[model samples]
Target chain A: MKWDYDLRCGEYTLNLNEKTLIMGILNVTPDSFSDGGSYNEVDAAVRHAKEMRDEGAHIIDIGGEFAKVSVEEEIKRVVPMIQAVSKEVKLPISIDTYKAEVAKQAIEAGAHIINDIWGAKAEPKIAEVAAHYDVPIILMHNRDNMNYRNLMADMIADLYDSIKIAKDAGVRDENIILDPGIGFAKTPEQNLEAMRNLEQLNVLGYPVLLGTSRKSFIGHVLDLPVEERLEGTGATVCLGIEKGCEFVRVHDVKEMSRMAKMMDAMIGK
Target chain B: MKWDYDLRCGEYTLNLNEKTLIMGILNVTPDSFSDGGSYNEVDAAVRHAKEMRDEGAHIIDIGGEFAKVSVEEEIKRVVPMIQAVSKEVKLPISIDTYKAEVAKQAIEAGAHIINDIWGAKAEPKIAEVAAHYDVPIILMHNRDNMNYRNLMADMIADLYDSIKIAKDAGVRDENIILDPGIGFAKTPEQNLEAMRNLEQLNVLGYPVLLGTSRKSFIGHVLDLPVEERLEGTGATVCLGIEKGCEFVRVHDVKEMSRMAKMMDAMIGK
Candidate 1:
């Protein structure tokens, strides 16, 4: 048996058993939390996408906003960026949205994956859109607030519920990836605990995706602001790979790419 | 049931279960392999050691030479540097030499550790010196040629033989550390294989040390020279930590320090 597994993301077949895939963060929004204007400041989004591709990114995830944005605004922001990146690089493009309309239009505009922070729970029809396009969808475990009798147990249950929603919406089991939402509603200690228990999230038998790049949890741990979190991000990426994460969403593609490959060489077959 | 371990280095105590200790490399030789001219160019060796400490080095390793220096020159180069560094910072200082006279003199000059590239084979008296001073000695596996019947097996066997020599010389169990000696007397494949099987080295029942910063192997893997191997070095550090390495000898103290602390939060107790 292989030490790691494989997953099918649209036309791209990722053998997680071979290497840990990197999804470069390309926020197309004007008001995103980190590196917002990098997309909308000029024609820099496509240039940035090509840079990430050269830095060894397997995918580029373009987002409209951090919180909620209008469906029209989300589609306008992501669809053009996805189209541009698809031409600029061979790497797959992921639409970072929980809205069904945005996901549908972005896929039609050349996006190969849907990254939903709410795990298809906020907008269940987004699962249908993912099912219709036959693209992979990353269902991140998230909550509106920190309400848990047992945090890890409740987190797993929430993700399982999202899985059931996807299944009900006709999304195939092979087309889904799970992410333990790191900076969404968890405290600093809770985030660390969740990372320590990331293997438990793998019990559902789906390929895991970790998006801890430059997040607030890393900031709190490293005691630095957003701009100085690459090394901390590298640490979490390595640990995530050890915990069986197949994909890592990151900002620093060059360093994280090398880290992922080296970690895979040691931790995988 | 303990998830971490500790080692005694002279008057210092290193908890292997905490952050991966960073041993900053300081070559005292003017014609050293990586960076030279610190030990004898001026009175700058102690100043450099203090800088590494500020950059987050747990230990500063002062090497008198790379290939071969006279025993008298080795002692003269490292003794004053180690003495000055010991006075400048609270961090433990290591004497990177494989000569009995140099090791003895450096220890007398306040060096807390002995780093022998010959694994106590070149000069068995060096281990005796370490025992006499009650300081930790890092026995790095090395040979004159790349001769190995079975590389990993031979390497482990060689290290075990060195461990026996240390024991015979009255070196305490807690004062011995092992290094696989990457970039020395092995093929690139052997170095990669050694890193892949670092857990097997840990079966020798002592803390493992990795010194792969800017090494030729990493340069070859990333296809970059010594000046551009920081990202490659980061990858190896993450893998080494995952494979049970307790100490990492590196050049980039600031970046590796952050990487080690982050990885420890995930991998340590």
Candidate 2:
């Protein structure tokens, strides 16, 4: 199930075949749960993006909010940050939002990809924005409840629904990436189950991106705080690569990139 | 193929079924390659062992020499270190040597296990020492040359010869462990191959120990020096646990132990 593809995003081309790519998390929300609003300003976000690029980030994911914010507020938070980061950093920039207007404005402001936590379900028009922009879109698996007759099967079916939505919007097959959405609307056990069987997502014939960096599941299992979850996150990243993930979304870009490179070498990537 | 057994060494019991164990490497050689003789003194070795224990080491491996040394010299180095660590730390102490006399003296000096890198081929009498003390013996795979008709097959055969020698010396099945000897007698490619297919070593019905911590293969693959191989070592350690390894010998015990714990949680150990 290994794949080789050149994800062309404007001036930058991500050679997914060469090695596992690192997507550094740059949450620009003032109420962000993890980083606590450190990079909310455009200059700080650009600095963080440049640091992640120096630490081996293939792409920078800029998120405007972790909770629901108005479309105008989300745009105000991310558009300037994306513009500054794309200008300062030499890597692809991804806008993490489920609103079509935010995705549209982010793309116009120099974002190269759309990372939808709702998998395009909350706002299906986000897929049209990605289609119009001709860029890659990361459709993350999520749900409103943990109800499942079967975990992996239900999760895969949900992802297929998102894929269908994207394809129906005229999005190209090559411009689609899937994320397992480790910390979104799932129990701790379900998260583990989803990660352990992540290979099932590959059946959709799209590159998978794992975003388990400093998630609550690591804190749940290891009984550690978010700040102390680096090793736990590294373990998840290595396992994700072993299960054939092509990209990893993480906050600790330097350490996780080293682990991904090491795992790539071990598995003959 | 996942076998559960209690590996009893003196008053300590290693529950092989619970989670992957961490064996902290304590090289007491004056010319040690990795630590550069920092822990050569018995007090320093004991302090280091205690630190590892605090950082989640299940066992402390005290090695007298990395290169060939006189049996008396090796005994003189490891026995005092083992005696000091065994008295100070709560973890089991394993003497890393292949000499029967050294193993015997170290066991008398309060070592709980014997780690024979030569796989009992250098001196089969070392097996007798382990059996006499009723201690767990780690027989590491080694060869004078890298010649092989087939890598895994020939390596398993060589390991079987070691197993037979230990059994013939009256070592109990529960008191035996195996090491693939990641840095010993294998090419860089072979080391990666061995680690990728480490589950093959599990077919012998003994717990396998992986010792790829800061080894040359990781350095070769990551283009890093020994000091910068912590993430590389963590990748191998996580993969080793994923492939059914029961133990990992490592220099970065704190980080590797965290990685192992996180991996064990992922694999539902």
The most accurate candidate by lDDT is 2
**Candidate 1 lDDT over residue span B68-135, tens digit each:** 66777666666667777787779888888888988888888888889999989998998899888888
Q: Which stretches of candidate 2 lie over 4 Å from their true place?
A: A27-40, A66-69, B27-40, B66-69
Q: Show the colliding residue pairs in model 1.
A: none
Overlapping backbone residue pairs in candidate 2 total: 0
Give candidate 2's whole-model lDDT.
0.87
Query: Which pairs of residues clash in candidate 2, taking residues 3 or more apart in a chain or in different chains?
Result: none
**Model 2 Cα RMSD, 1 decimal:** 3.6
Single-chain TM-score of chain A, each candidate = 0.91, 0.93
lDDT of 2 by residue, B21-74 (tens): 999998564644532223446667777887898999999888776566676777
| C-alpha RMSD in Å of predicted model 1 compared with the true structure | 3.7
- TM match of model 2 to true structure: 0.94
When summed lDDT is taken over every stretch of 10 residues in candidate 1 chain B, the lowest stretch is: B33-42
Q: Residue A60 of candidate 2: its Cα lDDT?
A: 90
